[PDB]
């Protein structure tokens, strides 16, 4: 394997009820441009191609929400990268400290994610 049409790719996707863009994995093309997304936290819902960002390793200087996986919510900016346990990490400068968070803990509030939807949007 190397590449496939959507299904299998790690991407970011909008969660419903006008939610933020969370990290996930495309599980199946539901149809009509809906693709079902296994969010990295284990959740599964369908999302339209317009609302999925597939070439989104979070750029440095991008503003993002930092998310301690238990639920603790804040926002900050990417100012570094790491790879650990074969998984992707970001030094978010958050409350004036450099703090390591992982992809699914570095999410894009919809307003932030819009600035990438214009390029990385499937639809």
């Amino acid at each position: 394997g190397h590449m496939n049409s959507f299904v299998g790719l790690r991407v970011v996707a909008k969660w419903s009820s006008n939610g933020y863009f969370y990290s996930g994995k495309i599980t199946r093309d539901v149809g009509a441009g809906k693709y079902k997304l296994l969010f990295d936290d284990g959740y599964e819902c369908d999302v339209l191609g317009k609302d999925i960002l597939l070439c989104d390793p979070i750029p440095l200087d991008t503003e993002v929400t930092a998310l301690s996986e238990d639920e603790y919510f804040s926002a900050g900016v990417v100012k570094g990268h790491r790879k650990e346990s074969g998984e992707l990490y970001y030094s978010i400068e958050k409350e004036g400290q450099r703090k390591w968070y992982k992809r699914m803990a570095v999410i894009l509030s919809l307003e932030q994610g819009n600035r990438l939807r214009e390029q990385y949007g499937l639809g």
């Binding site: 969660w15 419903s16 933020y20 936290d41 929400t65 998310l67 238990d70 639920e71 804040s74």
Partner: peptide
């Protein structure tokens, strides 16, 4: 069993 609710932006979670 799985980990906690993470964030579900449909409502606030008051950090």
């Amino acid at each position: 069993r799985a980990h906690s609710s993470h964030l579900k932006s449909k409502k606030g979670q008051s950090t």
